[PDB]
């Protein structure tokens, strides 16, 4: 597994290291509403059970390849000093995703160019999918990446970054950082059995943002493999 | 409750009457994959637990006001002679929805006209919501309805019809009626406690479609109130 995702952690190791840092900043399972975004696939169930067991109030969103469609309206809706934590993971299977696999094939078949369309457009009978593929097309072009060299892990990875930035857009619209503290933890979900390879973690307490490195957090011996 | 939804059934009564007719056409809990579309709200949980207890394989979608965004890609994905049944319910609370309530207010504030936009467009930071409101705007204009006279039940009701037609679009793209039999059951979910007011029910076995009236199905005395 690590031959693809060096930072991959067993999912319970991931949760413990997350509980450790959050508590460090005044978050508790009882004072925080969490939000999760995952692919619609049945396999994303473990991360989602683990998270809602860690928190009192949980609220989930999901779409193809974990694309974010709930917008500010969906996010503000799912929320009820204020404390939130936002998780987001596209998934992949090694030893899934499905929609990300289809994207890979098409992005290679036609240009990155053919696949891009402006924001605000979408296909009537493929809304989620078309929005998903269009955000990856733009994202790919915006980082001078060649889809010919990319494999499914690197696209699942590009996806995370895209998803991650769109989650950030929504949070700044929906949350007041002067009355609410919050955390953002995103990365890639991996199935063999279940792993999380973290890529981005920070907290915003008192409108001040601090980056965290989960990989530097000493693990609980009990929740390891 | 009935003062708003004459056909409202207790949810277990609804499930029994549904099990009775489906079995009549060769469906069983074990030979059928079901699919459910509901609002993203936490309250829609009972209908969803009841359905997946009735079936071996279940697959769910959901968005604001139960708008359908998974497209043909999401639907074909969620599926695995072939037998399927498709449920769809917007919700409402009497004694929810939230997104439908917001639509009501806006549709009344500006014209039905202002709110319509062509299919294939959507707002970048409100994808689900904007697609939801745009399909209701068009649907409203297409039935000479005046949003000034409409209340939240009638809009939840307009929504059902809209959702219902978009589900039909997807199914004909995604399912081969000559190799697959299927059923479509839609209506409105109501919270006091939990009710379903059915509005559309049919089955398609051997590319032949038969309408069913759940209201004429003799109820199980055991699953009533
Ligand atoms: Zn997936
Ligand atoms: Zn709702």
In the structure encoding, which two tokens stand for residue B78, read together?
A: 């969620």
Q: What is the gyration radius of the CA atoms in chain A, in angstroms? A: 17
Between β-strands B9-10 and A194-204, what pairing exists: parallel, antiparallel or unpaired? unpaired
- Nearest Cβ partner of B122 from A73, A99, A122? A122
For the range A213-221, what are the long-range contacts, defined as Cβ-Cβ under 8 Å and sequence gap of 24 or more? A214/A9, A214/A14, A214/A17, A214/A18, A214/A21, A214/A185, A215/A7, A215/A9, A217/A17, A217/A20, A217/A21, A218/A20, A219/A13, A219/A16, A219/A17, A220/A13, A220/A16, A220/A20
The verdict on A71 touching B (C-beta cutoff 8 Å) is yes
Which residues are A108's β-sheet partners? none
Question: Resolution limit in angstroms?
Answer: 2.5
Whether B128 sits inside 8 A of A169 (CB atoms) is no
Q: What share of chain B is helix, strand, coil (3-state, %, to 5)?
A: 45, 25, 35
Task: Find out if CATH 3.30.420 is the number for domain B9-215.
Answer: no
Distant-in-sequence, close-in-space partners of B99: CB < 8 Å, separation ≥ 6: A73, A74, A77, B39, B64, B65, B129, B132
CB of B74 closer than 8 Å to CB of B173: no
Q: Is residue B176 helix, strand or coil?
A: coil
In the structure encoding, which two tokens stand for residue A159, read together?
A: 């996806």
Look-up of token digits 């999401």: B74
Domain boundaries, chain B: 9-215
Whether B40 sits inside 8 A of A78 (CB atoms) is yes
| Burial of residue B149 (number of CB atoms within 10 Å: 0-12, 13-18, 19+) | exposed
CB of B42 closer than 8 Å to CB of A100: no
Tell me, what DSSP letter sits at residue B110? S
CB of A103 closer than 8 Å to CB of A163: no
Q: Which residues of A touch B61 (CB under 8 A)?
A: 40
Residue B65 to residues A22, B97, B132, Cα–Cα distance (Å)? 33, 6, 7
Whether A78 sits inside 8 A of B126 (CB atoms) is no
What is the 3 state secondary structure string of B19-63?
HHHHHHCCCCCCCCEEEEEEECCHHHHHHHHHHHHHCCEEEEEEE
CB of A116 closer than 8 Å to CB of A141: yes
Q: Judge whether B103 is annotated as a binding position.
A: no
Q: How far, in Å, CA of A130 to CA of A63, rounded?
A: 12
In the structure encoding, which two tokens stand for residue A54, read together?
A: 């860690």
| Gap from A215 CA to chain B (nearest CA, Å) | 32
Distant-in-sequence, close-in-space partners of B115: CB < 8 Å, separation ≥ 6: B106, B107, B133, B134, B136, B137
Look-up of token digits 């793209």: B173
Q: How far, in Å, CA of B70 to CA of B65, rounded?
A: 14
The verdict on A219 touching B (C-beta cutoff 8 Å) is no
Q: How far, in Å, CA of B26 to CA of B22, rounded?
A: 6
Look-up of token digits 């059970």: A49
Q: How far, in Å, CA of B51 to CA of B88, rounded?
A: 11
Nearest chain B residue to A78 by CA: give it. B41
Nearest chain A residue to B127 by CA: give it. A69
| Gap from A18 CA to chain B (nearest CA, Å) | 25
Distant-in-sequence, close-in-space partners of B41: CB < 8 Å, separation ≥ 6: A77, B91, B96, B97, B98
CB of A50 closer than 8 Å to CB of A13: no
The verdict on A122 touching B (C-beta cutoff 8 Å) is yes
Q: What is the gyration radius of the CA atoms in chain B, in angstroms? A: 17
Q: How far, in Å, CA of B205 to CA of B178, rounded?
A: 8
Report phi then psi at A90, rounded to 5: -75, 160
Q: Judge whether B70 is annotated as a binding position.
A: no
Whether B69 sits inside 8 A of A63 (CB atoms) is yes
Residue B30 to residues A26, B19, B50, B208, Cα–Cα distance (Å)? 48, 12, 15, 22
Of A45, A3, A41, nearest to A151 by C-alpha is: A3
Tell me, what DSSP letter sits at residue B217? S
Q: How far, in Å, CA of A55 to CA of A33, rounded?
A: 7
Q: How far, in Å, CA of A172 to CA of A176, rounded?
A: 7
- 10 Å Cβ neighbour count for A146? 9
Angle at B69 between CA B22 and CA A64, to 5 degrees: 100
Nearest chain A residue to B103 by CA: give it. A73
Which residues are A60's β-sheet partners? A36
In the structure encoding, which two tokens stand for residue B60, read together?
A: 């769910």
CB of B12 closer than 8 Å to CB of B50: yes
Q: Which residues of B touch A61 (CB under 8 A)?
A: 40
| Burial of residue B93 (number of CB atoms within 10 Å: 0-12, 13-18, 19+) | middle
Q: Encode A176-189: b = buried (16+ Cβ within 10 Å), e = exposed.
A: eeeebbbbbbbbbb
Of B212, B202, B185, nearest to B38 by C-alpha is: B185
CB of A126 closer than 8 Å to CB of B73: yes
CATH number for the domain running over A9-223: 3.40.1050
What is the 3 state secondary structure string of chain A?
CCCCCCCCEEHHHHHHHHHHHHHHCCCCCCCCEEEEEEECCHHHHHHHHHHHHHCCEEEEEEEHHHCCCCHHHHHHHCCCCEEEEEEEECEEECCCCCHHHHHHHHHHHCCHHHHCCCCCECCCCCHHHHHHHHHHHHHHHCCCCCCCCCCHHHHHHHHHHHHHHHHHHHHHHHCCCCCEEEEEEEEEEEECCEEEEEEEEEEECCCCEEECCHHHCCCCHHHCC
């Amino acid at each position: 597994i690590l031959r693809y995702f060096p930072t991959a952690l067993g999912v319970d190791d991931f949760m413990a290291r997350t509980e450790i840092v959050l508590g460090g900043f005044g978050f508790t399972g009882d004072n925080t509403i969490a939000m999760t975004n995952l692919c619609r696939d049945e396999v994303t169930q473990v991360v989602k059970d683990k998270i809602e067991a860690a928190f009192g109030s949980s609220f989930n969103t999901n779409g193809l390849g974990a694309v974010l469609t709930c917008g500010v309206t969906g996010m503000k809706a799912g929320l009820s000093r204020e404390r939130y934590v936002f998780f987001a993971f596209p998934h992949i299977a090694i030893n899934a995703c499905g929609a990300l696999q289809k994207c890979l094939v098409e992005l290679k078949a036609e240009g990155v160019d053919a696949a891009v369309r402006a924001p605000g457009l979408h296909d009537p009978i493929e809304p989620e999918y078309s929005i998903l593929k269009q955000r990856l097309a733009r994202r790919i072009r915006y980082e001078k990446l060649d889809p010919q060299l990319m494999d499914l892990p690197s696209l699942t990875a590009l996806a995370e970054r895209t998803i991650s930035d769109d989650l950030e857009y929504l949070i700044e619209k929906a949350v007041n950082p002067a009355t609410s503290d919050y955390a953002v933890i995103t990365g890639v979900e991996i199935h063999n059995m279940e792993f999380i390879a973290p890529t981005k973690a920070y907290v915003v307490v008192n409108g001040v943002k601090t980056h965290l490195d989960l990989m530097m957090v000493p693990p609980m011996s009990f929740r390891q493999l």
